Amino acid sequence: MILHALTQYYQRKAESDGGIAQEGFENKEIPFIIVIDKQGNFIQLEDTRELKVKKKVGRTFLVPKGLGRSGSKSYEVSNLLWDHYGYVLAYAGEKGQEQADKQHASFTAKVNELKQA
DNA sequence: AGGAGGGCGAGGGCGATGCCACCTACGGCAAGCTGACCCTGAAGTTCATCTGC
């Protein structure tokens, strides 16, 4: 009943049109949404921030669910089209390259294997 | 010698034993610090080790 009372309001909020992530997604707090054109060509790095006094990182975009990377070979997991400044740019703030480029070697792989599909 | 050595009844009566106010003033009852270190995680892989080959 701890969780069937949580499942049984997901099925209520998903049906009260309350705007809960629908069956494959997650209201992830995406702080620094990227803008690109129709053929690449990075346009703008908008930040969807500015909330309560500790600037919580992003407007909650209801994006494909976080895949729970959590491992030594965490780079392979590569969330679908939103991941990380280490997964999107291969830029490692503190994780070092080949732990952010291999992330980007898989995030690009994820996007491409989506593109082919 | 044999005396008698007080008998009586009073020993307070009356009222007052306080009146007046004051019984505090002032201000301070804190300052300053700390209220915790450390870890213990999911999840996954590696890596050292074991068993079997």
Side-chain angles (χ1 to χ4, degrees):
Chain A
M1 66 182 180
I2 302 299
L3 313 188
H4 189 248
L6 293 151
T7 285
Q8 273 299 332
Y9 67 94
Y10 176 94
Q11 281 141 349
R12 300 201 290 129
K13 203 152 179 182
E15 295 178 359
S16 72
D17 282 332
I20 201 159
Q22 65 181 359
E23 292 95 9
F25 294 81
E26 178 199 1
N27 280 320
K28 192 63 179 175
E29 206 162 61
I30 277 172
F32 292 92
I33 190 167
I34 280 186
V35 193
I36 67 171
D37 79 355
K38 201 172 294 298
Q39 64 275 14
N41 317 311
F42 180 75
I43 301 299
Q44 179 65 3
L45 185 81
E46 179 188 37
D47 59 330
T48 51
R49 294 179 293 173
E50 62 93 21
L51 214 47
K52 172 70 191 300
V53 297
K54 60 173 85 68
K55 182 183 288 186
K56 65 175 70 66
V57 292
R59 186 165 73 92
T60 75
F61 297 97
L62 189 153
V63 291
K65 193 142 192 52
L67 283 184
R69 292 189 296 272
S70 305
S72 176
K73 295 162 75 68
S74 176
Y75 41 74
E76 290 172 335
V77 180
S78 45
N79 296 115
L80 189 69
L81 280 154
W82 70 277
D83 220 326
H84 196 207
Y85 64 89
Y87 270 88
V88 176
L89 323 177
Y91 161 69
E94 305 98 299
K95 307 305 177 177
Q97 290 298 293
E98 294 294 328
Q99 215 276 324
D101 200 81
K102 294 189 96 74
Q103 296 181 2
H104 192 75
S106 48
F107 185 89
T108 58
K110 178 73 79 171
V111 165
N112 287 272
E113 66 88 18
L114 182 147
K115 171 206 183 75
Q116 327 308 345

